[PDB]
Write a protein that binds this ligand. Structure first.
Ligand code: O8G
Ligand code: O8G
Lengths: 194, 194
């Protein structure tokens, strides 16, 4: 029963590797999950609702990993601190590229998907700004731009850059260079007097 | 004749302020342009082709303005140099918000629109990287990240951040704070040793 929902989710993630949600049928999902097409509809109203659940699980997985870092002290240099945080997102989204990609596209056509992404981006921006404010408070970083504004542009950069890399977009930073690229830009803009 | 094509283009830009391309009909465009619906089809195959032409004109307008800066010496401090260049894009795209917004959305559904955007982004990245290399060559900026990689992430940040601002997205940087935000991040990451 609960195993049937998990089998629907696992099947959808697998097939999204191969083709867009547009070219996946409910029949495909039902067949991969070992249930009938009418039984599918007991668990989800649509293939679009299945993608929303997949995206929700990934975004929460990233959020929980970030909470684990936040809870620790972690004796570290400032560049390494930011690197480990950025790495949470690079690894979580990069381990679920097909779901990431389909999820980003569905933001244009789905109000629920648009809202889910917006909600977590707001949360992740507020935490970034809180960390920058703390750095400023102990005299480790200079009082330059408004911290929330700085944090917003840095996060939108990470969104656009990570996803362009994962999709093999033209133009993009090579996947093997993206972490180093983002970390340099974060560290210089947060600690730089100019 | 050539005035009829320009009237079709002017009408489309105006109506895009009010509503998405989805809710604009060929009848609307033909009526605003003072021609019949069959006469429209002499000039364009579709309302989608009209948007492509509008986007092409805007992107070329930005590109030409950047060329004018490139051609000058312009006796300036380094922060002011980058500011005037970033301002080209903030002002050009920000003077054509409806076309910008519709154009960005059409990248998902139109190969021609996707290609046009990709082509100009590549050009703008290559010029950014050439300027950073020149700065490094005269000893004004440190040899840190590969310049083309640095230039790619900085440009993708500007894309995502400008367009989120213009659309009133949640999250976004206020339109009145976006130029200062981007300039700080560009200057510190290009000139910062760390
Ligand atoms: N795009 N996107 N995803 C969001 C994204 O890329 N982020 C980068 C790291 C940010 C951050 N790291 C940290 C800490 C690291 C170590 C201790 S706290 N605090 O905020 C969280 C959001
Ligand atoms: N997104 N987007 N649009 C692209 C964008 O935002 N750009 C920012 C400025 C870049 C640039 N400026 C300059 C110069 C300024 C002054 C002399 S050269 N050279 O490269 C060009 C591309």
């Amino acid at each position: 029963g609960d195993d049937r929902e998990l089998a629907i989710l696992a099947t959808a993630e697998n097939l999204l590797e191969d083709r867009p949600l547009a070219d996946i049928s409910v029949d495909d999902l039902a067949k991969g999950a070992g249930i009938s097409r009418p039984t599918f509809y007991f668990y989800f109203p649509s293939k679009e609702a299945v993608l929303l659940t997949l995206l929700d699980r990934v975004v929460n997985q990233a959020d929980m990993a970030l909470q684990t870092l936040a809870e620790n002290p972690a004796d570290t240099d400032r560049e390494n601190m930011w690197r480990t945080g950025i790495n949470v997102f690079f690894e979580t989204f990069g381990s679920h590229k097909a779901v990431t990609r389909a999820g980003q596209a569905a933001r244009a056509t789905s109000v629920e998907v648009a809202e889910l992404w917006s909600t977590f981006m707001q949360k992740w921006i507020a935490y970034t700004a809180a960390v920058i404010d703390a750095e400023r408070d102990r005299g480790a970083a200079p009082r330059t731009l408004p911290a929330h504004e700085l944090a917003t542009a840095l996060n939108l950069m990470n969104e656009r850059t990570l996803f362009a890399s994962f999709a093999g977009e033209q133009p993009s930073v090579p996947e093997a260079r993206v972490l180093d690229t983002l970390v340099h830009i974060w560290v210089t803009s947060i600690y730089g007097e100019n």
